[PDB]
Amino acid sequence: KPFGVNRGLDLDKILHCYQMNDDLFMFVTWKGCSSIDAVHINDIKEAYPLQIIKYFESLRIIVP
């Protein structure tokens, strides 16, 4: 059965992410649904840009 954007639901929260070489996956929840999905960042870039940017803002960007 469908997962990711294919659920046709609206993005709820971005919980977490994981980088794999050049691939970045986001772990997300949808409104009205309880499941947690891995979604490639390319699949949500254009639908949810400000939510994705706000998620990155919430992270600690640091050195070294």
Binding site: H16, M20, F25, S35, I36, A38
Partner: protein, 41 residues
């Protein structure tokens, strides 16, 4: 800070389905899978 393992294994499956199991070697997958599990910690 606990997320059910089954839910994490679903997400890993999502990732395999996007990338394709034939797109990486088995150790590449195995090292990435450990990275995937540690990143939930």
């Amino acid at each position: 800070d606990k997320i059910r393992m089954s839910q994490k294994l679903s997400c890993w499956q999502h990732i395999l389905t996007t990338l394709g199991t034939s797109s990486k070697t088995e150790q590449e997958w195995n090292t990435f899978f450990k990275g995937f599990l540690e990143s939930w910690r």
